[PDB]
From Swiss-Prot:
Expression sites by tissue: Predominantly expressed in lymphoid tissues, such as spleen, lymph nodes, and Peyer patches. Also expressed in fetal liver, salivary gland, and spleen stromal cells, predominantly in the marginal zone and to a lesser extent throughout the white pulp. Not expressed in bone marrow-derived cells. Expressed mainly by antigen presenting cells (APCs) in T- and B-cell areas, but not by T- or B-lymphocytes.
The protein's name: T-cell immunoglobulin and mucin domain-containing protein 4
Induction: Down-regulated in lymphotoxin deficient mice.
Assembly with partners or alone: Homodimer.
GO CC list: membrane
Organism of this sequence: Mus musculus (Mouse)
GO molecular function: phosphatidylserine binding
Subcellular location, record wording: Membrane
Amino acid sequence: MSEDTIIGFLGQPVTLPCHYLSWSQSRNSMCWGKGSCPNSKCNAELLRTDGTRIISRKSTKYTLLGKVQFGEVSLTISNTNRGDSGVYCCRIEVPGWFNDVKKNVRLELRRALV
C-alpha cells in the first residue's frame, strides 16, 4: 500500500491516525514510537495503553483523545516543532506471535504566513 502522511503546522497540534475497531480490553494493548516499527514493540516510545487506558507516556506532549477501549488510538502531539517530523509507528499488540498490526506514519510540519 501507500502508508499515509500527515501535514501539520508548527507550534500546533497534530494527530496521527490509527484505529482498530476490532479491539478488546481483555486481549489488546498498544504503543506509539518514533521511527519505523521495530520487529518487537515500539522504539522511542511516546505513549502506551493497557486495553482500557494510557499506562505510560514520554511526557505531556503525547496523548490519546479517542477512547482506548474502542480502538481509537490516534496519537495527538501537542506543540509541534520541526523536530517532530518523520516516521512514527503505531503498533497494536495482538497476542501470540506474528499477528500484531504495525503501521508507519509520516509527519510533515510546515509554517504559515509568519
